[PDB]
Amino acid sequence: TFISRFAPDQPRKGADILVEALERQGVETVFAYPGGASMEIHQALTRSSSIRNVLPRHEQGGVFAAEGYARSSGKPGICIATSGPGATNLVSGLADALLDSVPLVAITGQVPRRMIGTDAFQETPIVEVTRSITKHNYLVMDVEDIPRIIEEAFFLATSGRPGPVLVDVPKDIQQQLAIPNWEQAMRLPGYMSRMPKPPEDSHLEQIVRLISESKKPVLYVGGGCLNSSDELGRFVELTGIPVASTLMGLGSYPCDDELSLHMLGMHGTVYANYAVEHSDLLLAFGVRFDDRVTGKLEAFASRAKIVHIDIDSAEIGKNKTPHVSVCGDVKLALQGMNKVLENRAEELKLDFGVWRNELNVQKQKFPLSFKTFGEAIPPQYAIKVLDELTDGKAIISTGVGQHQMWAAQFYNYKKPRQWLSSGGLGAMGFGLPAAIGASVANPDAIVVDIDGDGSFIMNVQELATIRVENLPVKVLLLNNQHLGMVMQWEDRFYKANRAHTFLGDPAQEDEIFPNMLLFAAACGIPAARVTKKADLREAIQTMLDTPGPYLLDVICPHQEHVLPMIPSGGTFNDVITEGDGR
Amino acid sequence: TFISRFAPDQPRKGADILVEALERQGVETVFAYPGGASMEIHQALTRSSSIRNVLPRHEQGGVFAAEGYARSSGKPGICIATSGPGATNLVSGLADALLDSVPLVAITGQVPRRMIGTDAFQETPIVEVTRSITKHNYLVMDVEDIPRIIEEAFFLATSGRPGPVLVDVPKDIQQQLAIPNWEQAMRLPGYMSRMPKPPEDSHLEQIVRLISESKKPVLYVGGGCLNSSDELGRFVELTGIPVASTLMGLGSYPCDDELSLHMLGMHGTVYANYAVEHSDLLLAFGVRFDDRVTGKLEAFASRAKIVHIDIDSAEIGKNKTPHVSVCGDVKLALQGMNKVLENRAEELKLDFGVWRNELNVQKQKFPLSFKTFGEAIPPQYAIKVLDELTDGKAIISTGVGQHQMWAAQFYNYKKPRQWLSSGGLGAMGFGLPAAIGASVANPDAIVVDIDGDGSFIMNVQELATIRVENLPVKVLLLNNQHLGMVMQWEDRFYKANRAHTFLGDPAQEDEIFPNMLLFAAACGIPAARVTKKADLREAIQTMLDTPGPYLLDVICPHQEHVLPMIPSGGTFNDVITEGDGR
Amino acid sequence: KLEAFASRAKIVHIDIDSAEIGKNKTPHVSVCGDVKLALQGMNKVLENRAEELKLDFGVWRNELNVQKQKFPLSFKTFGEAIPPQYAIKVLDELTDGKAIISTGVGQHQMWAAQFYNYKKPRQWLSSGGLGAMGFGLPAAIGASVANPDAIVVDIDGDGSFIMNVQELATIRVENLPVKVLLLNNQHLGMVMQWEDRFYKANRAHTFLGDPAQEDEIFPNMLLFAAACGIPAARVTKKADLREAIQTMLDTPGPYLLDVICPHQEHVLPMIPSGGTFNDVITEGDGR
Numbered sequence A, B: 001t002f003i004s005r006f007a008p009d010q011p012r013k014g015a016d017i018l019v020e021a022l023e024r025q026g027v028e029t030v031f032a033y034p035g036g037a038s039m040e041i042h043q044a045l046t047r048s049s050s051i052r053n054v055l056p057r058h059e060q061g062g063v064f065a066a067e068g069y070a071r072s073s074g075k076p077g078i079c080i081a082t083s084g085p086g087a088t089n090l091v092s093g094l095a096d097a098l099l100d101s102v103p104l105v106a107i108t109g110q111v112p113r114r115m116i117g118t119d120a121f122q123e124t125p126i127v128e129v130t131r132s133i134t135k136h137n138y139l140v141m142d143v144e145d146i147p148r149i150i151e152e153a154f155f156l157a158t159s160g161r162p163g164p165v166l167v168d169v170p171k172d173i174q175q176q177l178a179i180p181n182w183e184q185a186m187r188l189p190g191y192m193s194r195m196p197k198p199p200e201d202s203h204l205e206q207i208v209r210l211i212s213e214s215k216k217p218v219l220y221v222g223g224g225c226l227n228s229s230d231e232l233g234r235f236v237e238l239t240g241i242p243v244a245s246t247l248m249g250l251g252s253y254p255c256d257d258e259l260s261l262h263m264l265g266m267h268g269t270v271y272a273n274y275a276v277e278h279s280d281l282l283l284a285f286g287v288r289f290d291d292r293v294t295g296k297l298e299a300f301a302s303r304a305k306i307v308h309i310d311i312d313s314a315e316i317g318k319n320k321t322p323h324v325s326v327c328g329d330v331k332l333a334l335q336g337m338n339k340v341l342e343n344r345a346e347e348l349k350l351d352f353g354v355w356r357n358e359l360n361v362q363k364q365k366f367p368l369s370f371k372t373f374g375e376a377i378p379p380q381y382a383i384k385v386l387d388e389l390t391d392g393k394a395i396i397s398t399g400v401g402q403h404q405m406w407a408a409q410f411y412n413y414k415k416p417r418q419w420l421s422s423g424g425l426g427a428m429g430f431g432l433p434a435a436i437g438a439s440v441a442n443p444d445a446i447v448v449d450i451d452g453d454g455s456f457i458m459n460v461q462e463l464a465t466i467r468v469e470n471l472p473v474k475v476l477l478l479n480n481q482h483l484g485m486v487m488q489w490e491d492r493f494y495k496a497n498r499a500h501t502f503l504g505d506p507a508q509e510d511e512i513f514p515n516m517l518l519f520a521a522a523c524g525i526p527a528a529r530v531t532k533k534a535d536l537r538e539a540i541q542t543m544l545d546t547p548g549p550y551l552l553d554v555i556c557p558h559q560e561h562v563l564p565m566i567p568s569g570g571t572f573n574d575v576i577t578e579g580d581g582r
Numbered sequence C: 001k002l003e004a005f006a007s008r009a010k011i012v013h014i015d016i017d018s019a020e021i022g023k024n025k026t027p028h029v030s031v032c033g034d035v036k037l038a039l040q041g042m043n044k045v046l047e048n049r050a051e052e053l054k055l056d057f058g059v060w061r062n063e064l065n066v067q068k069q070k071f072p073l074s075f076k077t078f079g080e081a082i083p084p085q086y087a088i089k090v091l092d093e094l095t096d097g098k099a100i101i102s103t104g105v106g107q108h109q110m111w112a113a114q115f116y117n118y119k120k121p122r123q124w125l126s127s128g129g130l131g132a133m134g135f136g137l138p139a140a141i142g143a144s145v146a147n148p149d150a151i152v153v154d155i156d157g158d159g160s161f162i163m164n165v166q167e168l169a170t171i172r173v174e175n176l177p178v179k180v181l182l183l184n185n186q187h188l189g190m191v192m193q194w195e196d197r198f199y200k201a202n203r204a205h206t207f208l209g210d211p212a213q214e215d216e217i218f219p220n221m222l223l224f225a226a227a228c229g230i231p232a233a234r235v236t237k238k239a240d241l242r243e244a245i246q247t248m249l250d251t252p253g254p255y256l257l258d259v260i261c262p263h264q265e266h267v268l269p270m271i272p273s274g275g276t277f278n279d280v281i282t283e284g285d286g287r
């Protein structure tokens, strides 16, 4: 039973009712930046002892940290901001969280009810603005609805297909005194009547049947399986089916396994795309057939029966029409199909060794590779050295760009919730903040943000938060002085014509600019630089052993290119494997 | 005649047609940050020599710099960004520009037409998201509409009541080749039929009549007169009417004048609010009767006939019902009324010396003041010393908070376009970026960003832009280690209970954190610190004389409070004039 | 043309809706509030400061009284045909201007507005902003229930009436003394008019009768009422028009009087769309 701070019949401010509504939801952490419209809320937060508030230096950091918190754990992210400028500063975060289906609850303070529409001071139609970029939102119009709306937001944000839910709370409601009713029922008739029911055996056995009838079965795992790590594992050790995952599904199935095809897609391995290009059966679990994974949909698995299991009906059949589909929780489906494969084991006698070898050939004929030049540090190598020194147990947060794809390719994640990257919206500046969220959600864990000089400088101000909050965040900054992924798309489709991709200072293009070391210095964060591949281990070992937050600026040659690479809309026969800017 | 880069019959990419559409609009400057969806556009920009592109380190800086560019000059601001994360990063800027009625044109790249709604990669319903926070927006659906839509955007953004206009341009359209028609007519039948016509004499003389019938006339000038500096001046030297302006109207009428009542409102002078509280005639020109200016509308000028001249009909009568109103350009109205006051001069024989004295008493009984403690630097004094050393000729950009109100109170702006502050939305982190925009728009001018430690760290990354772009931006950072305006609202209404307003490091709350000096150091920007009020002049003189960008971190005691202060919704009889946190 | 509207006058606009004030015509003086309160207020001032003011507009009133006599509302009578205007006037007369009038939309609508003198508001129920046809009969039902002991008369057009003719069933079943003065001109009057004025009188599907016998009145509105147990009659001669209307009024219960009129009639005066006072048309029809 929840021990309240107020008497069951004692009236208290709405702001207090809100905070208590969060405590009753198990919330222990929020990322809130003060403002006129949310002052009451903040005051109410200080009255709470079960909830720690991590003050960011910019709302965008707040929302991204909330995402980190969410992605790095099972709990949803909770961020709070004031009206107008505060609120609009969360917009990027919500779109990000909506595209990557991330549990999030955003509380924005609003101007008093009567002033809504009057175009008052620091007022913005936040609900209208965030309609198409959130799972659902609300505008509290009665202090008596606070309990119900908060419970409904957390429910919606974490149930079905997880998503961001924003709650606008007018200032005057925050002040209004009242006696909360924590027994009110949720008003979600439509939603509840759309919640998938446990998978039926008729559908599950129909799949197992297709497996036994297949000769080239390939698992296409996505971030929809992040909670089915075990079930998914048991499944593979019962079918011996090669597993290929999306960028979002990394970790679901250990990348360092024998049956692992690693990440597939635009920048996936050549063998991962090969397996899918020639499979006769595609087991698409927890995936949404994104473009950077299929390219030309008519050429995607064109020679295979597609079984698509998804919790979201709308997703099923949207891009690629399945042969067999199952609208439901992938975890339940897995446990089910596992039982059938366990009993009817001998009867089935599944063997895909022939397929596995056909692939094991491509896997050795086109493995992930990187070139080393003189004593320069190869970003890929750096990451590998990190995987090594952290024994693949580190939680990685990332920015967006080349450095992002490498962190995805050269690190072997043991479990999900270990890889926190912006994939659907691909928002730069995600990394550092996300690492903050991860570190708070996982105090006793190695948290490392692998950033790009572009993505990092974008939210560099969160270094202040890292210090003030005493968070052991390790920043492995792969510095290439450019906007890598963009300067790359130039050498590939625009005759290498520099389109404002240089981030250094033209007055001295030989000097590293900005000096990321001094940035950390300003925030009391110990740092170092590495340029020689030779002293790279000592470097990374130091960053890891130095207690507290740390920043390692590891210089890399910009010419590097992320390969393999299947151009936008292309096919497996368009996979590029050679080229750069040397 | 515009000399094109392509033959009148030569087909070129849509992206090229766009850029040429901007050149034909007189655009010389853009603030664009690269992305997949805008690459074609950027490439097209490099083909242009009349347009300089200033690459920011974050889109929000881009849009705020575009605002600075716009506010600091007459031209509109033009910012460009890619889809998804790039685009949502402009949201704050648009709301800001919409609330402070600022000419702005935002070009966001979108995913290919066919992929719209497919929920593709890096895709966002930008048009839907920015509907309620822009003057108007567009989604280009045909490469043949680029010429017309661009011309319509610049028209709408700069005509009537200036505002932000966003243009979404799908990627595939940017690639599509075509032959532009620069003679197409604009499709704005409704808008054109709502454009106010020149003021009628019957209405203008009705005002002049009310002036001669008044004994206590008070001018209530707002940012709607930023282009009527002369007309407004001539008017005063013909009626001798005391002038009080909004935060947005600063500069319209020289603050260092004898007839100047300075800024009125929540933080306006006591005499400015007095004059309005006891005037019998309020000449509201270019104002929108905001809350932080009237408070309780029933008590605002309750004893006076209100003449409201506005270019926006919707604004007239919205908050305060006028006795006489004029929907039209305030500049035209002024020139008109000036002629009448010039001819019927002797006949009228206007004399308000009695009124002016009644006010001149309050002006001396309650002048703007600030206290000095020991050798500590008083933020107000610092600003005054700056006004002095720059001879009131410096363009000031500001953040939001206490430091913002002081920059508004203790500096005497000679003309409009000299004070660039976020007033309607009050977005923090506006300052530095805005100064960048001002410096590019005014190369040979003293540009000084007066920031708060909170507002500054929020977009600190633009220091990289300052350096790389070689901009003589001077940052007078009033460092008080707190969120001043917020910590203030606590000592006033929350018993001084700290609600996460401390920006320093709790581990050593005696040390200045962050070290803003090192931030500039990282970006090759010379800096210094000042703590003693004694060496404050040498300090500021140095910042001004050191060629190039400069950052002066001037330490101030946080306890300071912005006075006078009329609480939210209060009246002239609620004006606070004593209190702080000593 | 808004620029020509009262272009020579100071406009005082009192409205309860702020958005309305200044929307189309910028006022010199405006008052956002209840017009009733404003009136009571201004009345007191005009009552006290009466002698002081000594208001006299006799000169103005005469200047107008000249135009009022130089261009009064008129209508022409042809042979024994019934002039729709006259019919309405005869109704105003027999009902002593105490009848609640509901109307359809079209010529017949403008005439009911011009040739009847309403004593109070809530007596004239017409669709003016949207101008929805078929409003009349139903509206009369609403009026009759809201005013049991009152003379309710729907002045309809053959077009507007047939559109909701089914409510006759409601009239009967509900026992409502609804009187239908149907001005039958066999056409879509207001529309056939806009044709003779701007389209060289080219018939654009405005004929509501049967082409197979364009001399017969179609539909037979009498039989419609017959189907619903509603007593009816027809009038064609201007001579027996009074007896007709008197009967409709005296026959207890609902009643329908189909009064035939020559379609050529035109609603005048008429200022074309967007025109000005100098565009006022006062002569023309389709004879």
Ligand SMILES: Cc1cc2nc3c(=O)[nH]c(=O)nc-3n(C[C@H](O)[C@H](O)[C@H](O)COP(=O)(O)OP(=O)(O)OC[C@H]3O[C@@H](n4cnc5c(N)ncnc54)[C@H](O)[C@@H]3O)c2cc1C
Pocket: A099, A100, A101, A160, A161, A162, A221, A222, A223, A224, A225, A245, A246, A247, A248, A249, A263, A264, A265, A266, A267, A268, A285, A286, A287, A288, A289, A290, A292, A293, A309, A310, A311, A312, A315, A328, A329, A330, A331, A400, A401, A404, A422, A423, A424, A425, A426, A427, A485, B121
């Ligand atoms: C620079 C850049 C390059 C990229 N390159 C690649 C690349 O080469 N390869 C690649 O894979 N991606 C790449 N991406 C990421 C890519 O855009 C997509 O975000 C990713 O492929 C989506 O993977 P997903 O469908 O598995 O995850 P999501 O998009 O998160 O979709 C998960 C799906 O699982 C469903 N689901 C959720 N929970 C459950 C449950 N309990 N039971 C059943 N179903 C559930 C959802 O409703 C949904 O349909 C790139 C992104 C960037 C920024």
Ligand SMILES: Cc1cc2nc3c(=O)[nH]c(=O)nc-3n(C[C@H](O)[C@H](O)[C@H](O)COP(=O)(O)OP(=O)(O)OC[C@H]3O[C@@H](n4cnc5c(N)ncnc54)[C@H](O)[C@@H]3O)c2cc1C
Pocket: A121, B099, B100, B101, B160, B161, B162, B221, B222, B223, B224, B225, B245, B246, B247, B248, B249, B263, B264, B265, B266, B267, B268, B285, B286, B287, B288, B289, B290, B292, B293, B309, B310, B311, B312, B315, B328, B329, B330, B331, B400, B401, B404, B422, B423, B424, B425, B426, B427, B485
């Ligand atoms: C911390 C903080 C404190 C604040 N404190 C104060 C304070 O104490 N006092 C104060 O004044 N403000 C204060 N503000 C600013 C305040 O919120 C409003 O932005 C400001 O009062 C608006 O002034 P304005 O109406 O003159 O300008 P705007 O809001 O820009 O409105 C201009 C008006 O002029 C009209 N107009 C435009 N062009 C023309 C033309 N050519 N001809 C005729 N009409 C035209 C517009 O359409 C509009 O109605 C504060 C803001 C912050 C962030």
Ligand SMILES: Cc1ncc(C[n+]2csc(CCOP(=O)(O)OP(=O)(O)O)c2C)c(N)n1
Pocket: A399, A400, A401, A402, A403, A404, A425, A426, A427, A428, A429, A451, A452, A453, A454, A455, A456, A478, A480, A482, A483, A484, A485, A486, B033, B034, B035, B036, B082, B085, B086, B089
């Ligand atoms: C907020 C935002 N702005 C612009 C983009 C466009 N973009 C897509 S990939 C990429 C790569 C560059 O960044 P960097 O951090 O330096 O890393 P690198 O790719 O060089 O490793 C960019 C700029 C984006 N995704 N998000």
Ligand SMILES: Cc1ncc(C[n+]2csc(CCOP(=O)(O)OP(=O)(O)O)c2C)c(N)n1
Pocket: A033, A034, A035, A036, A082, A085, A086, A089, B399, B400, B401, B402, B403, B404, B425, B426, B427, B428, B429, B451, B452, B453, B454, B455, B456, B478, B480, B482, B483, B484, B485, B486
């Ligand atoms: C983006 C954003 N976040 C939060 C607020 C709420 N807020 C309003 S005034 C204020 C004052 C504090 O900042 P600082 O820059 O340190 O200056 P000071 O007031 O101390 O001079 C704040 C945080 C805002 N206006 N914009």
Ligand SMILES: Cc1ncc(C[n+]2csc(CCOP(=O)(O)OP(=O)(O)O)c2C)c(N)n1
Pocket: C104, C105, C106, C107, C108, C109, C130, C131, C132, C133, C134, C156, C157, C158, C159, C160, C161, C183, C185, C187, C188, C189, C190, C191
């Ligand atoms: C429901 C509907 N359909 C069409 C119109 C277009 N319209 C406008 S005035 C008019 C006049 C014709 O009707 P009628 O009832 O015969 O009367 P008359 O004008 O002939 O007296 C018409 C058809 C309308 N206002 N409403």
Ligand SMILES: CC(C)[C@@]1(C)N=C(c2nc3ccccc3cc2C(=O)O)NC1=O
Pocket: A159, A160, A161, A162, A190, A191, A194, A195, A196, A311, A312, A313, A314
């Ligand atoms: C798991 C189900 C319940 C899922 C996919 N279905 C909805 C969902 N539920 C809805 C319920 C009522 C009305 C509109 C809806 C729209 C959606 C939607 O697709 O966004 N939300 C979800 O998470």
Ligand SMILES: CC(C)[C@@]1(C)N=C(c2nc3ccccc3cc2C(=O)O)NC1=O
Pocket: A291, A292, A295, A296, A568, A569, A570, B035, B036, B037, B038, B083, B110, B111, B112, B120, B121, B122, B171
């Ligand atoms: C940001 C968008 C505009 C970006 C990265 N996206 C595409 C893109 N363009 C495509 C064009 C045709 C068919 C499939 C595509 C898939 C993608 C994709 O990778 O999402 N092209 C681009 O430049």
Ligand SMILES: CC(C)[C@@]1(C)N=C(c2nc3ccccc3cc2C(=O)O)NC1=O
Pocket: B159, B160, B161, B162, B190, B191, B194, B195, B196, B311, B312, B313, B314
């Ligand atoms: C100066 C006039 C033209 C002004 C105030 N009026 C509009 C304006 N013009 C419009 C024209 C057509 C349809 C809706 C509109 C809404 C507005 C509005 O108030 O936002 N825009 C302006 O700048």
Ligand SMILES: CC(C)[C@@]1(C)N=C(c2nc3ccccc3cc2C(=O)O)NC1=O
Pocket: A035, A036, A037, A038, A083, A110, A111, A112, A120, A121, A122, A171, B291, B292, B295, B296, B568, B569, B570
């Ligand atoms: C951000 C909002 C919520 C902020 C600054 N705004 C008010 C506020 N509250 C008011 C409440 C009643 C009457 C007039 C007000 C005017 C304001 C105003 O100054 O704009 N109170 C606040 O806390």
Ligand SMILES: CC(C)[C@@]1(C)N=C(c2nc3ccccc3cc2C(=O)O)NC1=O
Pocket: C001, C273, C274, C275
């Ligand atoms: C149903 C509409 C389209 C109708 C009756 N309305 C007009 C019309 N057109 C106008 C065209 C220009 C200026 C003023 C007008 C006023 C009207 C009006 O009477 O409302 N023209 C028409 O045909």
Ligand SMILES: [Mg+2]
Pocket: A401, A403, A452, A453, A454, A478, A479, A480, A481, A482, A483, A484
């Ligand atoms: Mg980089």
Ligand SMILES: [Mg+2]
Pocket: B401, B403, B452, B453, B454, B478, B479, B480, B481, B482, B483, B484
């Ligand atoms: Mg400060």
Ligand SMILES: [Mg+2]
Pocket: C106, C108, C157, C158, C159, C183, C184, C185, C186, C187, C188, C189
């Ligand atoms: Mg008719």
